[PDB]
């Protein structure tokens, strides 16, 4: 999973 919430888990 690529995510941003202020920065990979994919």
Contact footprint for a copy of itself (CB under 8 A): 1-10
In the complex, minimum distance from the CB of residue 8 to a copy of itself, in angstroms, rounded to a whole number = 4
Max intra-chain CA distance, the chain: 20
Task: Name the residue with tokens 């202020």.
Answer: 6
Rounded least distance, CB 3 to Cl ion, Å: 9
CB of residue 6 to a copy of itself, shortest distance in Å: 6
Chain discontinuities in the chain, listed by preceding residue (C to N exceeding 2.5 Å):
5, 9
Binding site for Cl ion (CB under 5 A): 5-6, 8, 10
């Amino acid at each position: 999973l690529v995510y941003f919430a202020a920065x990979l888990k994919a």
